[PDB]
Amino acid sequence: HLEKSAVLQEARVFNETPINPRKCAHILTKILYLINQGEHLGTTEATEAFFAMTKLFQSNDPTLRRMCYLTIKEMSCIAEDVIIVTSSLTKDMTGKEDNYRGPAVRALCQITDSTMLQAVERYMKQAIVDKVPSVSSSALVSSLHLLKCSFDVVKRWVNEAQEAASSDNIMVQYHALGLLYHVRKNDRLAVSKMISKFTRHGLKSPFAYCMMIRVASKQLEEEDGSRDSPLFDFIESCLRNKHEMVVYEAASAIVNLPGCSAKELAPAVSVLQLFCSSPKAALRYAAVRTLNKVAMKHPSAVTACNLDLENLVTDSNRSIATLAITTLLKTGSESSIDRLMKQISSFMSEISDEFKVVVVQAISALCQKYPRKHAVLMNFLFTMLREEGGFEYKRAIVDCIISIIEENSESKETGLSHLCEFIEDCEFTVLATRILHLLGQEGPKTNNPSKYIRFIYNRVVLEHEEVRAGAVSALAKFGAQNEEMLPSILVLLKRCVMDDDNEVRDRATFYLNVLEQKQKALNAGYILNAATRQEIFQEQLAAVPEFQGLGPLFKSSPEPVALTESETEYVIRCTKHTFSDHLVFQFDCTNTLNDQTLENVTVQMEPTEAYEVLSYVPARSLPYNQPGTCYTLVALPTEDPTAVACTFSCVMKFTVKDCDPNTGEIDEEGYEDEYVLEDLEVTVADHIQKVMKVNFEAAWDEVGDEFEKEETFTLSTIKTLEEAVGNIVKFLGMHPCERSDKVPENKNTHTLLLAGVFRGGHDILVRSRLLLLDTVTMQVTARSSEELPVDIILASVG
Amino acid sequence: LYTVKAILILDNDGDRLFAKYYDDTYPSVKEQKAFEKNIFNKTHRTDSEIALLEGLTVVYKSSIDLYFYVIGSSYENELMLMAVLNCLFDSLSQMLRKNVEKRALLENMEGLFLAVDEIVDGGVILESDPQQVVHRVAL
Amino acid sequence: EDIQSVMTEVRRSLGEIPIVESEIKKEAGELKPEEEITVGPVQKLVTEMGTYATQSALSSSRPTKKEEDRPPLRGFLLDVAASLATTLTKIALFVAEAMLLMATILDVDRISLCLKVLS
Helix, strand or coil, X not given: CCCCHHHHHHHHHHHCCCCCHHHHHXXXXXXXXXXXXXXXXXXXXXHHHHHHHHCCCCCCCHHHHHXXXXXXXHCCCCCCCCCCCCHHHHHHHHCCCHHHHHHHHHHHHHHCCHHHHHCCHHHHHHHHHCCCHHHHHHHHHHHHHHHHHCCHHHHCCHHHHHHHHCXXXXXXHHHHHHHHHHHHHHCCHHHHHHHXXXXXXXXXXXXXXXXXXXHHHXXXXXXXXXXXXXXXXXXXXXXXXXXXXXXHHHHHHHXXXXXXXXXXXXXXXXXXXXXXXXXXXXXXXXXXXXHCCCCCCHHHHHHCHHHHHHHHHHCXXXXXXXXXXXXXXHHCCCHHHHHHHHHHHHHHCCCCCCHHHHHHHHHHHHHHHCCCCCHHHHXXXXXXXXXXXXXCHHHHHHHHHHHHHHHCCCCHHHHHHHHHHHHCCCCCHHHHXXXXXXXXHHHHHCCCHHHHHHHHHHHHHCCCHHHHHHHHHHHHHHHHHXXXXXXXXXXXXXXXXXXXXXXXXXXXXXXXXXXXXXXXXXXXXXXXXXXXXXXXXXXXXXXXXXXXXXXXXXXXXXXXXXXXXXXXXEEEEEEEEEECCEEEEEEEEEECCCCEEEEEEEEECCECCCCEEEEEEXXXXXXXXXXXXXXXXXXXXXXXXXXXXXXXXXXXXXXXXXXXXXXXXXCCCCEEEEEEEEEEEECCCCCCECCCCCCHHHHHHHHHHHCCEEEEEEECCCCCCHHHHHHHHHHHCCEECCCCCCCCCCCCCEEEEEEEECXXXXXXXXXXXXXXXXXXXXXXXXXXXXXXXXXXXXXXXX | CCCCCEEEEECCCXXXXXXXXXXXXXXXXXXXXXXXXXXXXXXXXXXXXXXXXCCEEEEEEECCCCEEEEECXXXXXXXXHHHHHHHHHHHHHHHHCCCCCHHHHHHCCHHHHHHHHHHCECCECCCCCCHHHHHHCCC | CHHHHHHHHHHHHCCCXXXXXXXXXXXXXXXXXXXXXXXXXXXXXXXXXHHHHHHHHHHCCCCCCCCCCCCHHHHHHHCCHHHHHHHHHHHHCCHHHHHHHHHHHCCHHHHXXXXXXXX
8 A cells, every 4th residue: 555654764764775776676666656556745755755865876776776767757847946966967967877867857847947947058959969869869858848838948949950850760750750740830831841851751650751641631621732743642652651550541531522532542542441441440430430521422322332331240349330330321321221220239239349329429420310300210210219229318319309409390290299109108207308398499389289288288197296397387388379279278278287286286376376466468478588881981980080081981992902911910901991071091900920019100101193191190009919090091182183093102110119928018118110011002992882873864975975085995916805894894893784784605795884973972984885896996985973083984994 | 749648557446556647637536536437447347449438549458467548539540559559568578578467566566667658758659669678678 | 574584594504405496486475574664775685685695506506406497487576556566676677785795695606615625
C-alpha cells in the first residue's frame, strides 16, 4: 500500500554510505510507487525530500542518476525551486556520461523561467544540434513543455534556426516536423516554398508523411492549388510503399465525384477496400461513416453491394459490427434484404461484440433516414424495434420520437397508431413523459378525434395520478383549439370524467376550479401561453456633427471597395454614399495587425473629375480587429460638365503606436508613418435610382430636346455589342428597355433605351441604338435631365 | 503527438497499477476510476480488435494476466498506434525473457516504469520499436 | 401569520427532497391575509424574498425530477376592491428591505457552498 510516512522517516537511510544501489533504489521506488499510483502532499515535505535526496550525490552511481530524474520528473508544472541542480546539469554538460544529461534538461522545461532561460543558451543551441541522434532527441522534447509556457525564446532564432532540422534519421525526421506543426501554425507561406522541400525529397518515416498529410489535406479543402501534379505525386506516394497507413489515410478524403473524380482512384481504392475488407485495417469502419463519405451516384451504388455483404454476413469484429451499420446505411438498402437482416439482428443485437451500442448509433441513423417517414418502414421497424427489443429500444425511442417530430410526420394516424398501441404494452412511464409533452402541443391540428380521444382515455386509464394527469395537460392546447366536433362536448367532457383520491381529487377539482375561476375562453388563452436604403445611411452618418453638408442619401455605392487589399494589418473595406448634396465615404474596418493601433488617423483624398472638397475625417483611434469610422466628405457639383465621378487619392496617416495586447499602455508618444491609401473612384450608380419613365414617349424625346450628346463609333474588327454590353448594363446600373433589352445567345439588332435618375435630383437618360449592318456602327445617346450626366454617361459607361 | 491521455496498465480488477496521464485535462482519481469503470467494466478483460470510445481511439489490449489501456484519439491511425502497443508487450517479454503477469507486476514495477518513459514521454511518442531500446537499456 | 412563520421554520428545518407548487397554491386561497394587511411595494418585496428562496433552490440543477413547472398561474398568483387587488397583482408581475433580503438569500448557491465545504 501507499503512505508517505515510512519514507520521510526512512530518509535517514540517506545517512548511510553502505547502501546497495538496489537497496536504496527500492526505497526510492517506494515513494515513487505511492505516487505512480497517486499521492498528494505538502511542498515543505517535498522540499525536504529534495534536500534529503539531493544530499546524496557524490556518485555517478548510474542508477542513482536515473531515479532522481524520475523523481524530479514527477514535479514539472507544479514544481519547487530550480536552482539546486544547476551544477549537476552543468556537470553533465562538461561530463560525457552522455546518457544522463539528456533526461535532466527535459524535466526542467515545464518548470522553467526566463532568466534562467538565459542560461543554456549558447550551448543549448549547440545541444539541440548536437551529435548522435539520441542525444538530440532528448533535447527536443524538453522544449515543448516549455512551449506550453512559451518557446518563443526559441523562436526567434528561426531563419537561421530551422535549417539544422535537416535530418538523417527517419525517426528523427518524423519528429522534426511536428515541432513544425506549430512552425506551420506560425506559417503558411513558408510551407509553400517549403513544401517544395518536403515535396522536393521523398520521405523516410511513414510518420513524417502523416502529419504532412493532414496538413496537405488541410490545404486541399478549398483547393491546395493545382494539386493536379502534386496530388498526383502524392497520390503515388500515399498509394504504395511498405507502410499501409498512408494509402488509407489518403483514401478516405479523396473521393471527389458527384460527377467528379473517380478515375484511377476508384480502382486503387477498390484494391484497398477489398484488401482491408477483412480487418486488415479494422480502420475501414470509421471511414464509411464519413471520412470516406458515401451517398453514391446511381450505377455506382449497385456495385457496392458485395463488400457490404461481407461485413453484413460476417457479423463479427467490433470493427465489423460498426462497419455493417455504416456501409449498409451509406450505400442504402432494398426493403427485402432488410427482412433477412431483421431476423439476423434479432439474435445479433444484444451482445455480439456488444452490438447494442453500434446499433443505437445505427438506429439513430435509422430514425434520421426515416424519422417517421417511409412510415411503412417506420412501422415495420416499430414493430420490430419493440419486438427485438431487450429493452434497449427506449434510448433509441428518445431519438426516434424526436425524428418523427423533426419531419413533423403526417402518417401520424398510423404512426401514432403503432406508437399508441405498442407503447401500451411496451410500457415505460418515462417515454410517456416526453411524448406527452409533445403531444400536449399538437392536438387538433391533426384531427381524428374519436381515436385520439380513444387513446387519451387509455393513457389516463393507467394508474398514477401522474399518468392520468398528462392527458389533461396535453389537452389544454387541444381543448382550446377544439377539433372536428369538440367545443360543446369539450365543455361536456371534463364533467363526464371526474376524480377523487384527494390530491388526485384535487387535480380534477382544481383544474375545474381553475376552470371555475376563468371564462373558459379567456382561461384557455392565458394558461396556454432619393432617400434610399442609403438614406438610412445618410442618417447613420448623421450622429457625427463635424459636417460640412450632407443632404439625404440618393443611392449608395454599387460596390464597397476594400481600400486595403487582402488581410492587411490596416484592412479596409470602404463604402461610398451619395446624397442629393454631398457624398460621404465612410470607411469600415479592422486596423489589422495586433502590432498596431492607429491613432491620429485622418483620410486624404485628392480628386480628378469634380467635387468640392470640404474635409478628410479620420477616426480618433483604431485598435485591432475592430471597425471604427473615418470618413471623408465632399459636396457634389451637379450641372457642370464633369463634376461627381471622380477618383480620389488616398494616403493613410497615423501615428502608429505598438501594442501589448496582454495589458497594453496608451501614452501620448508614438510616431507617424503614413501608408498609401487606395483609390476611391466614384461611380454612376452610387447616385442613381434606375427606373422606368414617367413618360417615356415624351420623356424619351424630350430628354433629347434639352439634352443630348452623342458619340459614334464604327466597329470594324469585331461585330459584337458584347464588349460594349459588358461596360454599359453593368456601369450605369440601369435598366435596358422599350422591351429593348433581350437578346438570346445571339440576336440580329439591339437598342437599349435605358433608365435611372441621377443625384441632385436630375436624371440621366441613355439610348443606345446599337446598329448592325454587319459592322456595328452605333449611336449612343445620352440625354439627361442633368448636364453633368450626358458627358458622363458617354464616359461612365466605360 | 502529445497525444497520450493516459496509458494505463490496468489490472482487470479495474485496478490500475499504472497510469500516466501523459496528457490530461480531466482529473480525479475517482473520475479516473469512474471513467475507467464504465469502459473497463464493459470491456471486462475482453477488449476489441479495435475500439473507439469517445471518437477517440481506445487501444487497449489484454495479456494473459493484465489489461492494457492506452487512450488516444481516433485522429491517429491504428497501425502505428498499435505498433507501440505491440512494442510494449513484446520488448518486455523478450528483454525480461518474460512478458507481463500479475506476478511479474507484483514483484517489481520499476522496469515498466523505466521502459515507459523511454518509449513515450507524454503526448508524443518518442519511439515504438524495441531494439534501440534494448541496446540502449542495460539495467 | 402564525401559520406562515411555522411554515418558514419547518421549511428551514427540512431540506432533503420533495415537490409542491401545488402546496403553494393550496395555502394561498382565492384571497387570504398576508403581511400586516398590506405593505404594498414592501409587500411586493415580501412576496419576493419568501417565494424567491423557494425559487432559488428551484433555479438550481436536479437529480430525479420532483415536478416540471406549470406555474403559469404561478405568475398571477404571486402578483371593486377585488378588482383593484387583481390589478395590483398584475402590476407586480419596507419593500426595499424585503428585496435586499431576497437578494441575500439568492437555494442552489447555498447547496453549492455546502458541496465545496464537503470537498
